[PDB]
């Protein structure tokens, strides 16, 4: 059976931090999209430039699947033309985006009692990201006049910060697993 491995992305045991978001290329396969959405769970399902029902019409199947974890409050930033710490410094979608954004609450997986400090996000960055740019650097951010030379301190901050997902957080602070499919037509 030559079906596209959409299970390896949506069903991954571990998801990537948003600043180092994962990308999986899916090509040369027959994609069954109708059943993909069918799993009644996805709290967020929004497509741009394409209709989800009419994706089985596309002859080919050559799609990028980007996956990461953010706050519930930050789900709304995964969209064209959005601003904020995630859309500006972590994961930027273009204005002419052709694809779908899929997200679901994962508080039952990505939160620990003492706080799951494995998921990070970029807090400081001088300029916004280009669309689909991936900045994995953790150079000490110079917030002030004097340089840092890799040394932390005042006006010299580590650019990444952790979520610390706890199960007792509200849904805005709870973790959501996001999958972004990028289509080509």
């Amino acid at each position, epitope marked *: 059976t030559n079906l596209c491995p959409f299970g390896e992305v949506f069903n991954a045991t571990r998801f990537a931090s948003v600043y180092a978001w994962n990308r999986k290329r899916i090509s040369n396969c027959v994609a069954d999209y109708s059943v993909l959405y069918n799993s009644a769970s996805f709290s967020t399902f929004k497509c741009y430039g394409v*209709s989800p029902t009419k994706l089985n019409d596309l002859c080919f199947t050559n799609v990028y699947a980007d996956s990461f974890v953010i706050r519930g409050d930050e789900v709304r930033q995964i969209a064209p033309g959005q601003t904020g710490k995630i859309a500006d410094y972590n994961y930027k979608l273009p204005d002419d985006f052709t694809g779908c954004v899929i997200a679901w609450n994962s508080n039952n997986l990505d939160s620990k009692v003492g706080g799951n400090y494995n998921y990070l996000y970029r807090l400081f960055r001088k300029s916004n990201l280009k669309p689909f740019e991936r900045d994995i650097s953790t150079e000490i951010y110079q917030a002030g006049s004097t340089p840092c030379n890799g040394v932390e301190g005042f006006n010299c901050y580590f650019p990444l910060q952790s979520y610390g997902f706890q199960p007792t957080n509200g849904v805005g602070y709870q973790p959501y697993r996001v999958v972004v499919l990028s289509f080509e037509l």
Partner: antibody
Framework: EVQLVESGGGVVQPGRSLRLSCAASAFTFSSYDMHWVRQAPGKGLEWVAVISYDGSNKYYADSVKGRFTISRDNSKNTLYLQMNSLRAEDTAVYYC??????????????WGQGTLVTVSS | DIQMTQSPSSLSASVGDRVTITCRASQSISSYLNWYQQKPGKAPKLLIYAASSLQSGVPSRFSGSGSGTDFTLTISSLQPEDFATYYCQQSYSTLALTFGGGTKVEIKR
């Protein structure tokens, strides 16, 4: 030539349920997506839901998600909208609209005359 | 959601005048903008789809143009049956379709 005829509208108490129908004619109903759009009295237009041509896919606006249900019977050329847990903010005229299908995105090219749904106690 | 802002909310014209309606989008919706006409007590009627494509059966005095955020619907010669409300509707976010506030074309006296 496209013909869309709604029915099933009326009055309903808050929290109850109501089901609408939309009989289609003069076009291949089983190969087009169908929509529901409601318009509050004196307000603008608000998209509600959409169903695939074969009826396998259903997507709803956030204002009605987990509360309404859309379905279709391609053997009868009828579109349905099961409305459960109706609030006062659901009082509107409900249109069923055919998708034009000529684009990668949705758009309504033919509307029914609509039917009134009054939610009050 | 993407906000659609129409301007003016209302305008007054007479038969034969050229009417132009503006529709702005809170973010770039490319070219997936559609225009609808609604008379009072009637269902809406599709006029333009994909910014500028004229629907079959609609008089050629209607036309659309623009891309990105600024769009325009122009009635070259206003006819008596063209006094109505006109809505634009974005289709870029296919699962979050939104309409404009509407523009009423009333009779000038």
């Amino acid at each position: 030539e496209v013909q869309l005829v709604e029915s099933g509208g009326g009055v309903v108490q808050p929290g109850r349920s109501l089901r609408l129908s939309c009989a289609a004619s003069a076009f291949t109903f089983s190969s087009y997506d169908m929509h529901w759009v409601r318009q509050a009295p004196g307000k603008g237009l608000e998209w509600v839901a959409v169903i695939s041509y074969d009826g396998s896919n259903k997507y709803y606006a956030d204002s009605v998600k987990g509360r309404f249900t859309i379905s279709r019977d391609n053997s009868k050329n009828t579109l349905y909208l099961q409305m459960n847990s109706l609030r006062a903010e659901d009082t509107a005229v409900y249109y069923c609209a055919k998708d034009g299908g000529k684009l990668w995105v949705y758009y309504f090219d033919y509307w029914g005359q609509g039917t009134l749904v009054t939610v009050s106690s | 959601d993407i906000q659609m802002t129409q301007s003016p909310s209302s305008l007054s014209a007479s038969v034969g005048d050229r009417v132009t309606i503006t529709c702005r989008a809170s973010q770039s919706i490319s070219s997936y903008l559609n225009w609808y006409q609604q008379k009072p007590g009637k269902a809406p009627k599709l006029l333009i789809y994909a910014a500028s494509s004229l629907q079959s059966g609609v008089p050629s005095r209607f036309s659309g143009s623009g891309s990105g955020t600024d769009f325009t619907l122009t009635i070259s010669s206003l006819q008596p049956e063209d006094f109505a409300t006109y809505y634009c509707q974005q289709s870029y976010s296919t699962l979050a379709l939104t309409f404009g506030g509407g523009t009423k074309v009333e009779i000038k006296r």
